[PDB]
Structures are given as C-alpha cells and as structure tokens.
Curated annotation (Swiss-Prot):
This is Small ribosomal subunit protein eS12. One of its GO terms (cellular component) is cytoplasm. It is found in: Cytoplasm. It comes from Saccharomyces cerevisiae (strain ATCC 204508 / S288c) (Baker's yeast). The lineage of its organism: Eukaryota, Fungi, Dikarya, Ascomycota, Saccharomycotina. GO terms for molecular function: structural constituent of ribosome. Component of the ribosome, a large ribonucleoprotein complex responsible for the synthesis of proteins in the cell. The small ribosomal subunit (SSU) binds messenger RNAs (mRNAs) and translates the encoded message by selecting cognate aminoacyl-transfer RNA (tRNA) molecules. The large subunit (LSU) contains the ribosomal catalytic site termed the peptidyl transferase center (PTC), which catalyzes the formation of peptide bonds, thereby polymerizing the amino acids delivered by tRNAs into a polypeptide chain. Gene3D superfamilies: 3.30.1330.30. It holds the Pfam family Ribosomal_L7Ae. Belongs to the eukaryotic ribosomal protein eS12 family.
Amino acid sequence: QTAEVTIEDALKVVLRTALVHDGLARGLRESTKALTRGEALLVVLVSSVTEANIIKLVEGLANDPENKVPLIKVADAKQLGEWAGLGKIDREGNARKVVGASVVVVKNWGAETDELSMIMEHFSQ
RNA sequence: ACGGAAGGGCACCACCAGGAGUGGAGCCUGCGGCUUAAUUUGACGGGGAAACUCACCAGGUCCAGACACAAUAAG
C-alpha cells in the first residue's frame, strides 16, 4: 500500500531502538527463516533492491500474508542497513561505514513495543 | 681470639664387665652407580606402594592477542 515518510522513519527508528534490545534478523535469509518459524513480529523490506527474484518470492507472501505475518516497506537499502547497525553508524561526532541490508525482521520489540503496535496497525489499513 | 700447658668433671650417641648383635649368607628395602625414550627429584622427605599420587618419557589433541588499528562485510 501507499507508504508515507513518517511511517518509514518511525520504522527505521523502530529498527534502531529494537536493535539494542537484541531483537533483529538482518538479511534476506535470516528474515525468511524468521518468518518460517513464526518469529517475525514485523518485517521491513527495502523498496530499492535490484534483483527482484527473492522479492518476487516475498511479494507472493506479501500480497497474500498469513495471520502472523505483518510487513512494511522502507525507501533505501544502505539506510535500512544503517539503522540495523550495519550500513552506517553515524552519531553526533562519530562515523563508521559498512554495507546496507535488503530486509530486516523484528523478533523482540522491547524498547519499541507501542511503536511497532502503531506501525503494524496503521499498515492494517 | 688460640693452645696439641696443665686441672677437674661425667656422659653406655665414651670406655670397663658383659648381653644381643651387625659386618660373612639368601631375601627385603633405601642411597650411589650403570642402563634407559624416561628410569621425576630432593638431602627421611609421611618418600609406602599397576590408574590416581607424577612432578619423568614416546606420540595425538585443544585454547591463545586484552586491545588498538587498517581492509572485508549485511546482496
């Protein structure tokens, strides 16, 4: 469905603070295995991943989702890597560069419970 | 200080009178020695002793570096 900027930013900060809570699965494989075991409480998929194959497989389970499968889209790959600790680590004075991720799962919420509840309930519409 | 000048004790780790002996024998056990891949080692070691005790040998295994720092990395 139609993705807004508030939704995507609140989402990347959800990945940011639920990353600290030791509750993420950062990668295509770890997130697909996260969704096969019923461990994904919310999944984040990047809207700019070049190869569409694995996505054409995840977009078949996105258009027809299960009762325990909520998803949501972000804007870029390198940045969704960044908020998951990967991609980049940029704070007021410090910087460190890695490479960006395609999809990331939130297994344990913790410090972002009401935020992932809001994000998942506004994607219900 | 030192005496190997002399004088006393005062003693079965000294001598008399003995007693039992040991040293000779086989076996035990400790020390040295040689031999050994090692025959662990101190000068009784609570040192009793096939694993343990092993501290010595022939080989087969693990587990290494706090960290800092440069690349990689999430496709």
